[PDB]
């Protein structure tokens, strides 16, 4: 329950996640970038929906760019 | 610090005796010298729109609503009307109801949208594009509006009429930007390379005249007895085009002359400085001739150039890039000015500062660019690339004092924005030669270097397949500048490209390679059949099956990114005319005809980024799965699913294995066969739209960055999420340990089927600082021009200094460091990208790399 | 404030002025022109 | 009554006894005999739609708006997507929507408008003329959304697209229909040639399926390594024409079900006759069937036609018309019914009688057309021409059952439309010709009779024009039918004439000589400058100088004339697609091109009308002012100016001087150097869309009187407002004095530059309605045929019953008589026009004139 | 009156009809068939 | 005065004359079909304006289709 996965109507949208940026073309989907490697990677995974998807690291929130890629 | 040579001691002492003291953390902050007071200024107060990571870097930067709401006021107006016509009308409102902007201390005027700190957007693009402004914090206001312009359009928009002539799954997996970067249809992301030469010679009443007359030309044609319908019909878009092309001039001058008369008021009625009274006035009468009459001098042209920037690469359509030959286009107006004194008389220092002011006016240039493209430029507002130098149609030297004055005003004002590319050639003069290497060795990252040979000499090969038989002529080949960072295309008054469908748009190999392993499956970013299904792991039984797989799946990608590009083109030229690029181009204007409808220089192209990367993968492949069977593929797949965790010892063992710019053998040998045989070998078997090949462009910008991040683990060693090389033919950071001419001498070898290759090199900053610097660096260039090579740019920064910018990025700001093909604000750049440039390799050199480069102190 | 466009002038239409005004923010001061009627 | 010829005493007795003593004017009131009780109620209760003088005869008949208001909410709807596939969606919401009509007594269904005392009109074609219909006593209704509708409509239509390309002024002339017919996209009148033959026998899911495949190829095509840009796009167009076709297919299929389920429901819920029901589910199935599948029987083509005639003459868009071979492509199913009995078991004279439905069927036709082609087909709904006879391509007779059947029909029926032409070949079987004859000696004013060869020989000379080499084929040649009244055209799977863009038109040459004596200027219809400043009377000191002058007025005018047409077709192509025409068109489906766009045989003609009036005028000059000089051109143009008044002698000279058609040397030397060099001469210089030449067609249709109307006092003695000559090449009514066999020799000295004209006669009845009618006939036609003249068609009426009907129209509703190039009821035409028909010369033959038609006794 | 469509139709919509009703003028008897929801 | 005239806003219009009958291309326009002839022609007359010209042979009404070309 830590990866991505629906939950209709969900409290805690990846929309709303500061771990969330969006797509770069849709901005209907979105890129989660939680997983952050200890040798740097930020190993993304892809957003098919983000008002209807969640998961446990969910934290409200925006990291500004120098956290981002 | 000291290197013995052929029997001489060198010492790499600073050639200022300041800097053996200043700490190596702070120099670059301690180097700018803008020319005069008023660009010191302008640089103080410099309205700079980075963006990084999708985003603005500073809160104040947010979309227009104007140029959205008159474009949508025109075109319900004009519904009916002719396409082109409806075109110009569009611009034309847009023009005549802008508000303009004047700013303290300018010479230079003009600008986008309806404030200072703003920038208009594009809903005749991409309606995914507007849609994700509208949910982002710097929205057009008021949203509303926004919101019922952006669903006007979206029936009409470029991405609306070309989605239809594709798969929808193959749609999809594009607009990842993972495999593929998304066509433009899709962004609104574009380039161009407007006919400067022809506003500045001739202006815009001589064009309208002339459009005039072949209108009234065709139809006393129509009405000529006996009728021929087989002919007489081709005048109906003929007169479209040039009625268009008047429309479009009319506003143009329309709107200089409005941009004038606010210079007239302010000096008039808000200046109380009777300095800046004159200096206003001064301004308010060159924008009152120009662009409508022939540019007279070199403060004309200027402010002509950057008029014709504007309706170019922002009004009348977004385009990215600067292309032009600026020493070249401006040399005349120069020479009237600063060397005869006949119309607007001037120093060369004057001039050097009006360059400077030129730079501060690109720097505050904010893009309204889609977010993909607010990703893959950190640090900087967007690709503005200019060229200098190289050779004139005779193939003598084409550099200058006014070459000079643009590198003195670069070295100067220090602006990460515009960069520079340099075309190098044996003919070049080394007073010039010495100015870039000021540049390079003060760390700009610019010029970049290209060689003129081989660029001169594609002109010429890709002029053959026009199809209208007026590519360029052997003297005109000599006439080129690069179109965004890397790739060769014509300059002047006719033959320019017009659009990033003719060539652009990028491939990403190391995805490619990862789906290759995984019959066509993305597991690790989308979850999803991102490629053709060409096979399972155990299908794949010998490494010629690996090899013939990732040729799958580059032909299926490299099919979609042209064919993609190929249907914008159709539509573009049909719904999205460029009436006032076209009444600009001699050949357009000449036969009627659309900017984007009318190609006669075909220059097919994209760009393989990450190319290294699968490069490197295939090497490790071949070397410990198949030739030593080490692991099986099952074995290596299982640890890639793995992330490598657990398999630690199977990671560095890829790690190790050969890598691409040792001049290692087993590597260079498969390597070499990748680029020439899949990567270029491959590609240009596909003809575009202007019935020429396409050929690569290795490049990298911000995307090595941003696929890395949505590529898995891969054999060369990576996790997954990490970059991806940074070049087209860059060694992978940190893995080339034989010094700066191994690299050399791997990247010499890639000679056929390509179009160019992005070559980033890291130099110590010690010896390039030193008094033999300059030696050294002209010998390495006059080697890597021997070599055949493409193209090589400098980073030239210390480690210290970019750790402690990352540490007090306010204590930083005038730090600026390459990227890839393109320069930025280092603290401007996210922590990912910086930590990339800060593992590039700084490359010392060693007696025998010095004798290798035939060094002479 | 409020100037009427020069009758001479290419974008001259009847009623036709630059409406101009001074701002100045944290970066500094300019001038802006929107055209009205 | 008697005449002596050979040595013997000819009796000209009515072969009916009867007939001796039936007053001569009421003889038509005593012909019909429909072949069924059904027939005869169905002609009884007739829906009759004529129009005279720019209005309907008949209160009831008014405009609908469902076609209008359903077009319109399918064209807001479908903004954005390409217009092929607007034009498809359009069709295919109208046809969705509309209200069907079923009738009693019908076997033969459907219709194309909301209500059968409507018909439909057509917002995208010509704003005025719909403006035209809101200010009507029949306008649509609710007037107040009619309004609205072609408020949205205006800078959509087709009017309004080509209007920019021309002078207004140019425009202000034609319009005024004096001097030249209105361009077609003024109007919106038109005309088109079916490819029946492939709905017949391939039925419509055929073409959906082929389409379907096409697409799938095309899609497959583009998404094929190694993508070729200059290749690959062509693939765009044509997936766009296929989907429409689809689009277009489908909603025909589906509302001629509809159709099919009308009748059922009726039988099941209406309809209380058993015998009714059984008939009405017998009409059901047929239209469940047809057209979607290949017709197996008469019954299944004569419904597939119907519906096929009501898509491509009303519903996709408005043309005139019913061209069609309609022996030749019924005679496989008759075969297969009557004669084989193999399905739909039928009798010789149950064809008969199916015919006769479908004769009432067109008679109850409504025309949405404009006021102007509601003024010049007096008497009738609209041109309805069908032709007959003829080759085929082995050149043998084309005659057969089927053709008798079809011209029995006629005979029996007697309704005005649609008119016949019998394409005459001396191969044509006796048993046929009588069948002809039967309806020309009854008054029926049809068959026209067409030269064979000299069609056919015009197919192969045009075929060699071809703009993708794929004209008529020799044996292809034999297969032509009349597009309107007079000129030939291709029928069948494949190149028929898809549009009057391409051949249709009119000009008129009494008008334009008489601004020839004016210095181009219409002093009396419309008191402005009506053609070129061609030089005042003073300059015209010849009467070269006179011939020059026409031909300057003509060459302006016939080069609007045909510019006109070009431009219209270069935007119906692209804005007015027939996809459901396109998918029926063999080469159309082959191509993926619509049926405006793809042109394989060219056909181009324009019609002079109002010839022999300019004609006989330039006679009378010629011979009164400058040979004779008897007056000079002051005194002639003073005369003119005064409508003769107070010049009574000088118009009787000019009456009497020499006349075309009575093989009269003077006259007829300057009259085909006129035709010849002038009219057929400097038009065949032009070169339509098609790339072929444009060449004459002379006809007339109503048109003769209502330009008569337009034009002042001529030479030929006319005063103004008086009607012009009555065909292409008729002698003016009243001026022919030397007889029949005259008139021919005459009209066969026009030999070259023609592609036909019209030759209006007209037979003493007595004659022709005795025991010898036929054997004089038959030799006329010999004859006719011997001296290579191209067209004739006979009136067979006496004056008394013809000035009885005016006295008392109540009692006369059966009296049809020829105008020109089609036939109408007597009552129904305006005195006017009915007068110029009383005025034509009733012809007797004498014994020399049997004897040079080598008549046989 | 009215009709509900067949739903194996080539035109049938979930509720949609054919309302039919007979006319008769002057001419004669017909039927008129709009499709309705 | 016998002839067409132009006359602003007058009561008597050609367009509600019934010797007038429209233009056949444009209804804005009209033809007179005043000027008949004992010998039976109908010289017609270009309108250019229906709504403000008349002259005095101006009589309210329509004729039938018998009466006009
Ligand atoms: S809620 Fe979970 S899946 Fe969604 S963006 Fe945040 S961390 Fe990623
Ligand atoms: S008012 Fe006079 S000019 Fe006008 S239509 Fe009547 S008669 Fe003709
Ligand atoms: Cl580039
Ligand atoms: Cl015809």
Same mark, same amino acid.
């Given at each position: 329950?830590?990866?991505?996965?629906?939950?209709?109507?969900?409290?805690?949208?990846?929309?709303?996640?500061?771990?969330?940026?969006?797509?770069?073309?849709?901005?209907?989907?979105?890129?989660?970038?939680?997983?952050?490697?200890?040798?740097?990677?930020?190993?993304?995974?892809?957003?098919?929906?983000?008002?209807?998807?969640?998961?446990?690291?969910?934290?409200?929130?925006?990291?500004?760019?120098?956290?981002?890629? | 610090?000291?290197?013995?040579?052929?029997?001489?001691?060198?010492?790499?002492?600073?050639?200022?005796?300041?800097? !053996? @003291?200043?700490?190596?953390?702070?120099?670059?902050?301690?180097?700018?010298?803008?020319?005069?007071?008023?660009?010191?200024?302008?640089?103080?107060?410099?309205?700079?729109?980075?963006?990084?990571?999708?985003?603005? %870097?500073?809160?104040?930067?947010?979309?227009?609503?104007?140029?959205?709401?008159?474009?949508?006021?025109?075109?319900?107006?004009?519904?009916?009307?002719?396409?082109?016509?409806?075109?110009?009308?569009?611009?034309?409102?847009?023009?005549?109801?802008?508000?303009?902007?004047?700013?303290?201390?300018?010479?230079?005027?003009?600008?986008? +949208?309806?404030?200072?700190? $703003?920038?208009?957007? /594009?809903?005749?693009?991409? #309606?995914?594009?507007?849609?994700?402004?509208?949910?982002?914090?710097?929205?057009?206001?008021?949203?509303?509006?926004?919101?019922?312009?952006?669903?006007?359009?979206?029936? #009409?928009?470029?991405?609306?009429?070309?989605?239809?002539?594709?798969?929808?799954?193959?749609?999809?997996?594009? /607009?990842?930007?993972?495999?593929?970067?998304?066509?433009?249809?899709?962004?609104?992301?574009?380039?161009?390379?407007?006919?400067?030469?022809?506003?500045?010679?001739?202006?815009?009443?001589?064009?309208?005249?002339?459009?005039?007359?072949? *209108?009234?030309?065709?139809?006393?044609?129509?009405?000529?007895?006996?009728?021929?319908?087989?002919?007489?019909?081709?005048?109906?878009?003929?007169?479209?085009?040039?009625?268009?092309?008047?429309?479009?001039?009319? +506003?143009?001058?329309?709107?200089?002359?409005?941009?004038?008369?606010?210079?007239?008021?302010?000096?008039?009625?808000?200046?109380?400085?009777?300095?800046?009274?004159?200096?206003?006035?001064?301004?308010?009468?060159?924008?009152?001739?120009?662009?409508?009459?022939?540019?007279?001098?070199?403060?004309?042209?200027?402010? +002509?150039?950057?008029?014709?920037?504007?309706?170019?690469?922002?009004?009348?359509?977004?385009?990215?890039?600067?292309?032009?030959?600026? =020493?070249?286009?401006?040399?005349?107006?120069?020479?009237?000015?600063?060397?005869?004194?006949?119309?607007?008389?001037?120093?060369?220092?004057?001039?050097?500062?009006?360059?400077? $002011?030129?730079?501060?006016?690109?720097?505050?240039?904010?893009?309204?660019?889609?977010?993909? /493209?607010?990703?893959?430029?950190?640090?900087?507002?967007?690709?503005?690339?200019?060229?200098?130098?190289?050779?004139?149609?005779?193939?003598?030297?084409? &550099?200058?004092?006014?070459?000079?004055?643009?590198?003195?005003?670069?070295?100067?004002?220090?602006?990460?924005?515009?960069?520079?590319?340099?075309?190098?050639?044996?003919?070049?003069?080394?007073?010039?030669?010495?100015?870039?290497?000021?540049?390079?060795?003060?760390?700009?990252?610019?010029?970049?270097?290209?060689? =003129?040979? *081989?660029?001169?000499?594609?002109?010429?090969?890709?002029?053959?397949?026009?199809?209208?038989?007026?590519?360029?002529?052997?003297?005109?080949?000599?006439?080129?500048?690069?179109?965004?960072? $890397?790739?060769?295309?014509?300059?002047?008054?006719?033959?320019?490209?017009?659009?990033?469908?003719?060539?652009?748009?990028?491939?990403?190999?190391?995805?490619?390679?990862?789906?290759?392993?995984? =019959?066509?499956?993305?597991?690790?970013?989308?979850?999803?059949?991102?490629?053709?299904?060409?096979?399972?792991?155990?299908?794949?039984?010998?490494?010629?099956?690996?090899?013939?797989?990732?040729?799958?799946?580059?032909?299926?990608?490299?099919?979609? &990114?042209?064919?993609?590009?190929?249907?914008?083109?159709?539509? !573009?030229?049909?719904?999205?005319?460029?009436?006032?690029?076209?009444?600009?181009?001699?050949? &357009?204007?000449?036969?009627?005809?659309?900017?984007?409808?009318?190609?006669?220089?075909?220059?097919?192209?994209?760009?393989?980024?990450?190319? *290294?990367?699968?490069?490197?993968?295939?090497?490790?492949?071949?070397?410990?799965?198949?030739?030593?069977?080490?692991?099986?593929?099952?074995?290596?797949?299982?640890?890639?699913?793995?992330?490598?965790?657990?398999?630690?010892?199977?990671?560095?063992?890829?790690?190790?294995?050969?890598?691409?710019?040792?001049?290692?053998?087993?590597?260079?040998?498969?390597?070499?066969?990748?680029?020439?045989? *899949?990567?270029?070998?491959?590609?240009?078997? %596909?003809?575009?739209?202007?019935?020429?090949?396409?050929?690569?462009?290795?490049?990298?910008?911000?995307?090595?960055?941003?696929?890395?991040?949505?590529?898995?683990?891969?054999?060369?060693?990576?996790?997954?999420?990490?970059?991806?090389?940074?070049?087209?033919?860059?060694?992978?950071?940190?893995?080339?340990?034989?010094?700066?001419?191994?690299?050399?001498?791997?990247?010499?070898?890639?000679?056929?089927?390509?179009?160019?290759?992005?070559?980033?090199?890291?130099?110590?900053?010690?010896?390039?600082?030193?008094? #033999?610097?300059?030696?050294?660096?002209?010998?390495?260039?006059? @080697?890597?021009?021997?070599?055949?090579?493409?193209?090589?740019?400098?980073?030239?920064?210390?480690?210290? !200094? $970019?750790?402690?910018?990352?540490?007090?990025?306010?204590?930083? #700001?005038?730090?600026?460091?390459?990227?890839?093909?393109?320069?930025?604000?280092?603290?401007?750049?996210?922590?990912?990208?910086?930590?990339?440039?800060?593992?590039?390799?700084?490359?010392?050199?060693?007696?025998? =790399?010095?004798?290798?480069?035939?060094?002479? %102190? | 404030?409020?100037?009427?466009?020069?009758?001479?002038?290419?974008?001259?239409?009847?009623?036709?002025?630059?409406?101009?005004?001074?701002?100045?923010?944290?970066?500094?001061?300019?001038?802006?022109?929107?055209?009205?009627?």
């Amino acid at each position: 329950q830590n990866q991505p996965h629906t939950e209709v109507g969900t409290a805690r949208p990846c929309r709303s996640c500061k771990w969330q940026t969006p797509d770069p073309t849709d901005p209907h989907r979105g890129q989660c970038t939680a997983n952050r490697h200890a040798m740097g990677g930020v190993w993304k995974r892809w957003l098919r929906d983000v008002e209807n998807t969640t998961c446990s690291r969910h934290e409200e929130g925006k990291l500004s760019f120098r956290d981002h890629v | 610090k000291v290197l013995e040579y052929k029997g001489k001691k060198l010492n790499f002492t600073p050639e200022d005796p300041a800097e !053996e @003291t200043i700490p190596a953390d702070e120099l670059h902050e301690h180097l700018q010298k803008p020319s005069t007071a008023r660009t010191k200024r302008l640089k103080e107060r410099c309205r700079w729109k980075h963006a990084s990571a999708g985003e603005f %870097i500073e809160k104040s930067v947010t979309a227009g609503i104007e140029r959205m709401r008159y474009l949508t006021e025109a075109h319900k107006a004009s519904e009916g009307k002719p396409e082109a016509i409806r075109r110009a009308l569009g611009l034309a409102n847009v023009l005549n109801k802008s508000t303009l902007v004047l700013q303290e201390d300018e010479f230079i005027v003009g600008y986008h +949208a309806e404030d200072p700190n $703003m920038f208009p957007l /594009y809903p005749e693009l991409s #309606h995914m594009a507007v849609q994700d402004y509208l949910r982002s914090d710097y929205s057009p206001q008021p949203a509303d509006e926004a919101a019922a312009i952006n669903e006007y359009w979206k029936p #009409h928009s470029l991405q609306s009429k070309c989605q239809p002539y594709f798969d929808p799954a193959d749609l999809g997996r594009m /607009y990842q930007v993972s495999s593929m970067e998304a066509p433009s249809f899709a962004s609104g992301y574009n380039s161009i390379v407007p006919p400067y030469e022809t506003v500045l010679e001739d202006g815009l009443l001589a064009r309208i005249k002339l459009a005039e007359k072949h *209108i009234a030309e065709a139809q006393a044609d129509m009405s000529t007895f006996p009728w021929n319908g087989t002919k007489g019909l081709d005048n109906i878009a003929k007169i479209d085009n040039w009625k268009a092309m008047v429309i479009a001039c009319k +506003a143009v001058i329309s709107w200089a002359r409005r941009q004038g008369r606010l210079c007239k008021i302010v000096a008039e009625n808000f200046e109380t400085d009777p300095k800046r009274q004159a200096e206003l006035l001064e301004i308010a009468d060159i924008c009152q001739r120009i662009p409508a009459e022939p540019c007279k001098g070199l403060k004309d042209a200027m402010q +002509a150039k950057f008029f014709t920037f504007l309706i170019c690469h922002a009004i009348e359509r977004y385009a990215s890039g600067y292309a032009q030959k600026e =020493d070249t286009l401006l040399w005349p107006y120069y020479k009237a000015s600063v060397v005869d004194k006949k119309f607007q008389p001037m120093s060369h220092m004057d001039a050097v500062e009006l360059v400077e $002011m030129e730079r501060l006016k690109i720097s505050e240039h904010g893009a309204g660019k889609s977010r993909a /493209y607010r990703e893959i430029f950190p640090g900087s507002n967007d690709l503005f690339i200019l060229t200098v130098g190289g050779t004139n149609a005779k193939g003598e030297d084409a &550099c200058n004092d006014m070459t000079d004055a643009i590198l003195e005003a670069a070295k100067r004002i220090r602006t990460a924005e515009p960069s520079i590319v340099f075309r190098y050639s044996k003919k070049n003069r080394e007073k010039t030669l010495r100015w870039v290497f000021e540049c390079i060795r003060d760390g700009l990252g610019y010029p970049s270097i290209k060689h =003129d040979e *081989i660029g001169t000499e594609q002109m010429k090969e890709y002029a053959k397949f026009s199809l209208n038989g007026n590519g360029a002529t052997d003297e005109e080949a000599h006439n080129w500048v690069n179109v965004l960072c $890397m790739s060769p295309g014509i300059h002047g008054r006719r033959k320019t490209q017009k659009t990033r469908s003719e060539g652009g748009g990028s491939i990403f190999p190391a995805k490619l390679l990862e789906i290759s392993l995984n =019959d066509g499956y993305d597991w690790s970013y989308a979850d999803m059949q991102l490629g053709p299904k060409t096979g399972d792991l155990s299908s794949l039984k010998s490494f010629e099956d690996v090899w013939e797989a990732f040729r799958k799946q580059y032909q299926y990608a490299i099919n979609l &990114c042209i064919s993609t590009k190929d249907v914008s083109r159709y539509f !573009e030229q049909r719904f999205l005319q460029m009436p006032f690029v076209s009444a600009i181009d001699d050949g &357009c204007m000449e036969l009627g005809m659309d900017a984007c409808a009318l190609s006669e220089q075909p220059n097919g192209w994209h760009n393989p980024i990450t190319t *290294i990367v699968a490069a490197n993968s295939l090497v490790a492949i071949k070397k410990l799965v198949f030739e030593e069977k080490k692991y099986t593929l099952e074995q290596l797949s299982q640890a890639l699913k793995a992330n490598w965790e657990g398999f630690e010892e199977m990671r560095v063992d890829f790690k190790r294995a050969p890598k691409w710019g040792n001049d290692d053998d087993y590597a260079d040998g498969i390597i070499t066969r990748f680029y020439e045989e *899949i990567i270029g070998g491959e590609m240009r078997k %596909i003809t575009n739209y202007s019935g020429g090949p396409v050929m690569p462009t290795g490049q990298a910008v911000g995307l090595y960055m941003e696929v890395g991040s949505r590529t898995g683990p891969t054999p060369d060693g990576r996790f997954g999420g990490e970059a991806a090389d940074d070049g087209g033919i860059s060694p992978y950071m940190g893995t080339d340990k034989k010094g700066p001419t191994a690299v050399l001498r791997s990247v010499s070898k890639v000679q056929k089927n390509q179009k160019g290759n992005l070559l980033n090199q890291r130099l110590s900053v010690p010896i390039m600082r030193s008094k #033999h610097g300059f030696e050294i660096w002209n010998s390495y260039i006059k @080697t890597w021009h021997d070599l055949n090579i493409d193209h090589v740019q400098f980073n030239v920064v210390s480690t210290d !200094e $970019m750790r402690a910018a990352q540490r007090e990025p306010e204590k930083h #700001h005038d730090l600026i460091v390459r990227v890839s093909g393109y320069s930025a604000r280092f603290v401007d750049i996210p922590t990912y990208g910086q930590n990339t440039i800060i593992a590039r390799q700084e490359q010392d050199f060693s007696a025998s =790399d010095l004798e290798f480069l035939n060094v002479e %102190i | 404030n409020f100037f009427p466009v020069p009758k001479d002038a290419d974008d001259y239409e009847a009623g036709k002025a630059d409406c101009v005004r001074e701002k100045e923010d944290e970066k500094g001061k300019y001038w802006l022109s929107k055209p009205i009627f």
